[PDB]
Structure 1
Amino acid sequence: GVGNASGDWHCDSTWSEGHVTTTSTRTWVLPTYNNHLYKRLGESLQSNTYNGFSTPWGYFDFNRFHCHFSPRDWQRLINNNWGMRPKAMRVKIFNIQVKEVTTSNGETTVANNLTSTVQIFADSSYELPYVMDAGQEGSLPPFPNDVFMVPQYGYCGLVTGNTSQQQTDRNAFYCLEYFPSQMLRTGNNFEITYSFEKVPFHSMYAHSQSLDRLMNPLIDQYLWGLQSTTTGTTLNAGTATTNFTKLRPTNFSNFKKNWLPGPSIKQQGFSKTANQNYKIPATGSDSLIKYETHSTLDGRWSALTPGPPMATAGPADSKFSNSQLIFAGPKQNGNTATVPGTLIFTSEEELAATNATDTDMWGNLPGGDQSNSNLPTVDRLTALGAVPGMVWQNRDIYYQGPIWAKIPHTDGHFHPSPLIGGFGLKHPPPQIFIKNTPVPANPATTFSSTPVNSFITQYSTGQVSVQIDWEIQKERSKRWNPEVQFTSNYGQQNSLLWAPDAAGKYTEPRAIGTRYLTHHL
């Protein structure tokens, strides 16, 4: 009822053998969006052209690791386990409070509206465009004490061509009121359980072996290969002779191998040092999107980012590329920056053990056929798809990164591991929608068929609990020497990091991946 709480606060984590359960509770605030309306969106902006609808609904997003793990819990996870994956999820929305806002001569006053409801439903059949996996804001804040605003639900429709936002007969419009939903007054609560499909464990380890060094460095191969086609050390000089050799130690680059580095697409490398880059504007015919690796879908350019899993530059190197995820640093509050130091660069350098380098190339190959009179040019293999015998590691997941992505509803897909990182799921955690039910204001006393457009101003607030059961696999290495471990090593600090400062503001100072432990190939 009114004077009885419909749920309690729960924010712990229980570790067991092969399992860990996270529990997170936060307070949310839901305003009335679009003034209770559905607005048709759309704008012709060349490669940025889009169309769709903004809805009056809000939705819950739990798609970031820091929503579920405290920094210390993340450390417990990554320093001791080789793998992890989500198993189950339970969500609760309770302690609903609908507030009525009234304006007067001076300030505005808020009051409880005990009879008003909010509507809530989970799109458990995936009938609505899924947007919880687009690397966007709106997830539960990392800090348990923070109160967040429920994000407004909106979706994009089919864009035809690369110049007009105009919709065709294929474009769909989805009305969310057209779905069944629970109506909740201040005493009611909402709950939903979900199970994850079996997904592979994320690999929480860096490789301690290189793909091109899997042989016994003490033994020769029983395989032979061409060593040279002339005597000497000079090109186009010496005596022509087919010099063959048994492949033996210290000539590892020429050993016959069973496996190849995974697929790759060359990205453009930029320096964190301004004057080290070519001057390329943000807009115009020569905008940056042009000089950045990009895919073309229906004439529209889409920057390749982060792109396929590739080895990148170290997080502290002077260079970076679109293959690297960049987060706002602890002192970054705006939405633009000219100083890279205010941002947090992630890195996939551990991938150099099996994956090709993002700003380099997969390799080289002949530009033609050689002969005693023709030396072919050495062509660059800047892009290469799946070839039999290739192996690769997916990119890493981050503490402040996404957890899952919905695998697109298509006939074909190659290695459905979301490129921003995480778990590709056919049936991901369902989107949960919430909306403040409209309450008509004082009506006219004469009938009118015109739809009511006068409403009492309201907003709701409540709590949301999310519990995730995770399956983990402990590292079982036989390595003798100490491993690398994520450790607090900031030294002397005026204000303890990973903690609210003197003013009470909580910020995340660094990006934490999951690859400290190692594993051989």
Structure 2
Amino acid sequence: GADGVGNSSGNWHCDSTWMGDRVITTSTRTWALPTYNNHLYKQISSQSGASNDNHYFGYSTPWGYFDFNRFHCHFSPRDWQRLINNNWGFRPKRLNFKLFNIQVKEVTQNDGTTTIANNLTSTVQVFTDSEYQLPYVLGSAHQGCLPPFPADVFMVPQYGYLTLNNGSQAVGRSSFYCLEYFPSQMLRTGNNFTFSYTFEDVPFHSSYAHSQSLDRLMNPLIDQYLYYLSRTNTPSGTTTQSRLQFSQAGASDIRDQSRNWLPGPCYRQQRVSKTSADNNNSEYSWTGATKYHLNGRDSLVNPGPAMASHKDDEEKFFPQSGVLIFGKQGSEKTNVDIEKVMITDEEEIRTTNPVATEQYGSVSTNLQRGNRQAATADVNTQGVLPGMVWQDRDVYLQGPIWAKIPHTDGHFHPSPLMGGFGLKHPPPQILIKNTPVPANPSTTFSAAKFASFITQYSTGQVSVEIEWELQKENSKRWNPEIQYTSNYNKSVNVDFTVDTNGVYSEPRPIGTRYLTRNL
């Protein structure tokens, strides 16, 4: 840091600049940090009797952490539109981080009034691990983001983690991390903190949608030179006999043509409808779910593999867990009606990824003979096969930007299943805490742990700046594209704006896929 109590440690920077090829964004927010857990660590675990699936064991810490991982932190609704309408892809490159204008307040709750005053000599300490030595919590899509709207103020969320358990009990291999055991940087009023970071090379995210379905790749005018088996028998006299005929596949045969490629893999979902009348009356929620089984307990696959949500001309149906779901403004935690949630749509991927609610295809179950008749069965789960292409899941406007790839001997197509960018060395976790200030010890000496501290909290401003790389488009498409538009009719409230009471709200999910490409 630098200088005094009266001097300011940083300016407010929130802006976006568009350079053409690369592009740069900036934002600044205001935060407040409480003391958590009365300055002490605690182990936490599952509560008494619980399902074998719900057991957990871990620790909670006094430390907080910053999360900018959602897009809406970085991009405004309009800045989001020189991106998704004008471009075929984007990726991050490098970022900056800064804290400044730190001030610490102590509070006195005596009687029915609470007085608050500056504590000028108190400190707040911050570090960034950057060696990836801690359990990495970010990327699990928790709350506690920097707000989407720059004028809001937010608390910093508390930090904690989980470790191997058996039931509600720990195992010998289970690990315990003390955050005090790292070098950090102690800051007072008039001290600031910075670091900078560089993304590893990662593929552009695909903001295009395809103009060709994988099942139609070819010229309708010209027939193939390959033959397929067409008729298996022919009438002879009164009744048929076995005769094999072959054919070349034309535009009337398009079903039957040879191809060089296959659709992507599927792991199948249950289908439900937004119209309440079509759905069965029972509780199938947990029973009818698709799950995976790991170490004797069952977990839902909430996003699951990337698959189209519905087929043509059914907009009413979506996979049970297969989609992301966002809440509207002020929605509650539990048991809330469908009118409150916002359900995203995965469609444009129909052309490669198969629909999530249907089988991959059909396969032959048996060997035919004279007295046996051919039999097939549906394959509801398919792994990856050579010659198989697919697309990934869209990032939308608000959702995960990145995730940390687990450190393991093998992995396949690491792009993460919620969306965004898989990173082996992602942006490091930033951790922050209030330094404990003891209160009025006894006159005689005693060896005991202090239970008594001054009650205080801190606040300041944080800033983030990321540099993005863009991919422009050369398209010879003659006719116009599909663009993201706001409706021009009159309305009581404007979208993406404060209401009369001053609560900013986001009307609908906005994906990145509009501009079209050929497959």
TM-score, normalised via structure 2 length = 0.95
CA distance in 1, matches of 2:107, 2:314: 50
CA distance in 2, matches of 1:153, 1:279: 41
C-alpha contact 2:84 2:512 (8 A) present in aligned 1: yes
- 5+ residue gaps, structure 1, are 282-286
Q: Residue type of the partner of 2:445?
A: F
Q: Which deviations, in whole Å up to 9, do the C-alpha atoms of 1:70-102 show, x marking residues without a partner? A: 000111110001000010110101111111011
Relative to structure 1, the CA distance from residue 221 to residue 338 in structure 2 (aligned partners, 3 Å threshold; closer, same or farther) is same
Q: Given the alignment, which residue of 278, 303, 306 partners 2:303?
A: 306
The 5 Å alignment of 1:366-381 reads: 366-381=364-379
Q: Given the alignment, which residue of 238, 256, 262 partners 1:254?
A: 256
Q: Residue type of the partner of 1:112?
A: N
Q: Given the alignment, which residue of 175, 178, 191 partners 2:178?
A: 175
CA distance in 2, matches of 1:328, 1:316: 23
Q: Residue type of the partner of 1:54?
A: S
The 5 Å alignment of 1:331-480 reads: 332-480=330-478
Q: Given the alignment, which residue of 221, 224, 228 partners 2:227?
A: 224
C-alpha contact 2:331 2:340 (8 A) present in aligned 1: no
Matched, 1:107 2:132: no
Number of aligned positions between the proteins: 508
SS of equivalent to 1:81: coil
More displaced, 358-367 or 142-151?
Answer: 358-367
Match of 1:141 in 2: 147
CA distance in 1, matches of 2:428, 2:445: 41
C-alpha contact 2:96 2:197 (8 A) present in aligned 1: yes
Matched, 1:165 2:168: yes
SS of equivalent to 2:230: strand
Q: Given the alignment, which residue of 222, 245, 267 partners 1:243?
A: 245
SS of equivalent to 1:67: helix
Match of 1:284 in 2: none
Relative to structure 1, the CA distance from residue 352 to residue 159 in structure 2 (aligned partners, 3 Å threshold; closer, same or farther) is farther
SS of equivalent to 1:412: coil
Q: Which deviations, in whole Å up to 9, do the C-alpha atoms of 1:186-242 show, x marking residues without a partner? A: 11111110000000000001111101111111111111110121248xxxx843221
CA distance in 2, matches of 1:296, 1:453: 44
TM-superposed deviation, 1:250: 2.3
Q: Residue type of the partner of 2:142?
A: Q
Matched, 1:37 2:64: no
CA distance in 1, matches of 2:245, 2:56: 62
TM-superposed deviation, 1:63: 0.6
CA distance in 1, matches of 2:258, 2:459: 65
More displaced, 37-46 or 83-92?
Answer: 37-46
User: What is the percentage of aligned positions where both structures have the same residue?
Assistant: 59
Relative to structure 1, the CA distance from residue 21 to residue 316 in structure 2 (aligned partners, 3 Å threshold; closer, same or farther) is farther
Q: Which deviations, in whole Å up to 9, do the C-alpha atoms of 1:439-495 show, x marking residues without a partner? A: 111111111111112111111111110000000101221111100011111621112
C-alpha contact 2:144 2:155 (8 A) present in aligned 1: yes
Q: Which deviations, in whole Å up to 9, do the C-alpha atoms of 1:35-62 show, x marking residues without a partner? A: 1111101115411111111110000001
Q: Which deviations, in whole Å up to 9, do the C-alpha atoms of 1:389-443 show, x marking residues without a partner? A: 0000001011111100000111111100110000000000100000011111111
Matched, 1:120 2:109: no
Match of 2:288 in 1: 291
Q: Residue type of the partner of 2:210?
A: H
CA distance in 2, matches of 1:372, 1:329: 63
Two-structure CA RMSD over aligned residues (Å): 1.6
CA distance in 1, matches of 2:275, 2:444: 70
CA distance in 1, matches of 2:491, 2:54: 44
C-alpha contact 1:90 1:194 (8 A) present in aligned 2: yes
Q: Residue type of the partner of 1:374?
A: R
Match of 1:323 in 2: 322
TM-superposed deviation, 1:341: 2.2
Q: Residue type of the partner of 1:129?
A: P
- 5+ residue gaps, structure 2, are none
SS of equivalent to 1:424: strand
Match of 2:27 in 1: 24
CA distance in 2, matches of 1:159, 1:84: 41
More displaced, 312-321 or 36-45?
Answer: 312-321
SS of equivalent to 1:47: coil
CA distance in 2, matches of 1:120, 1:280: 52
SS of equivalent to 1:380: strand
